[PDB]
Amino acid sequence: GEPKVYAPVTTGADGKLSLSVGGYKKTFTKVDAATKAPLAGAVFQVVEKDGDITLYELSSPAGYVPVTNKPIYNISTGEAFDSAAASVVKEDGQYYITNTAAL
Amino acid sequence: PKVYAPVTTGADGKLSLSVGGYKKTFTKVDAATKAPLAGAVFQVVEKDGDITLYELSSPAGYVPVTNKPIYNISTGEAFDSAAASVVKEDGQYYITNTAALA
Amino acid sequence: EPKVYAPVTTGADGKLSLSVGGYKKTFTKVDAATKAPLAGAVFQVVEKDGDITLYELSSPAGYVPVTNKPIYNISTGEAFDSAAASVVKEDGQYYITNTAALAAA
Fold first, then answer.
1. Is B66 within 8 Å of C99 when comparing Cβ atoms?
2. A-chain residue closest to C33, CA distance
3. Residue-number span of the structural domain to which C85 is assigned
4. Calpha distance B92→A89 (Å, rounded)
5. End-to-end alpha-carbon separation of chain B, Å?
6. Is residue B102, in this structure, part of any structural domain at all?
7. C window 38-67, beta carbon within 8 A of A
8. Which of C15, C35, C98, C91 minimizes the C-alpha distance to C62?
9. CATH code of residue B79
10. SS3 of residue B20 by DSSP
11. Alpha carbon of A61 to those of A32, A74, C57: distances in Å?
């Protein structure tokens, strides 16, 4: 159909990811699974495929397990993330995207 | 610089660069199996008489291709420039997308 | 012996100073959209078991990050399929394109 592909989005040293698309607003925080420290260098993008709004992780941060173009979170369906890989976690009322450190 | 809308590849993966009078056809396939891919998004942009085909996004599970010029039609003396993802075989044009490492 | 090649950093012209033996080749690191030369992109060519490959150790500032990304196979004269979407041949020269990356916060 008519999919609006947003520009590529990379996370800074704070690891934050503010997604204000449409009538939905949410902030993530890319962190390491073991250390919970913020991560920088994760590429994200949003496409408006039909009516569903999905968040992809085009690239994982450097030194971490590669996450290549995988759907991570469905923005249109609320908290119903795609759940193909449950890397999204809630803690202390905050949302975090998880990347596993490579060996 | 004109206005063109994004298009999504289907089960056939057929792409037609029918702009003005210069027309080219492509088939989005896999880089290993040459199987027709679905999910890629492409858009057309014309700038100074150069019609360029960009890949806005690659299908899920494949290597990310983000706003990369794949094929460019030159209406002047320059020849048509293409990215390395364009392969010619059996008199056809193939747009390849590499699958994920895992 | 394994020949170790020194890495190059692209300047304001965006050109790559690749000069392996007689296989000397010219690449130009440019923006994927504005087609303007980019600086700061760190490349290096290495060899392992008779396979000359061109790696990108770092992408230019403000663009999609890249760490140890294979780009071009110098031995075969063929770009890797995973990076084939970024290798473009225009007027006899080869160009390496990069897409600008926006902030997340």
1. yes
2. A7
3. 8-98
4. 47
5. 40
6. no
7. 64-65, 67
8. C98
9. 2.60.40.10
10. coil
11. 10, 21, 14
* Partner residues linked to B102 by β-bridges: none
Output the six-digit token pair for B43.
Answer: 């858009």
- Identify residues after which chain A is interrupted (C–N over 2.5 A): none
**A4 within domain boundaries:** no
Q: Three-class SS of residue C85?
A: helix
**In which region does residue A61 sit, left (phi positive, over 0), alpha (psi from -120 to 50) or beta (all else)?**
beta
DSSP state of C83: G
Return the number of CB contacts < 8 Å for B and C: 57
Which amino acid appears at position A66 of this protein? P
What total of structural domains would you count in chain C? 1
Indicate whether B1 belongs to any domain: no
Residue C22 inside a domain? The answer is yes
Structure tokens at B37: 């891919």
| Structure tokens, A25 | 């607003």
Chain A: nearest CA to C4, how far in angstroms? 24
Say how many residues make up chain A: 103
The shortest CB-CB distance from A59 to any of B6, B57, B64 is to B64
In chain C, the residue whose alpha carbon lies closest to the alpha carbon of A63 is C67
Q: How was this structure determined?
A: X-ray
Resolution (A): 2.9
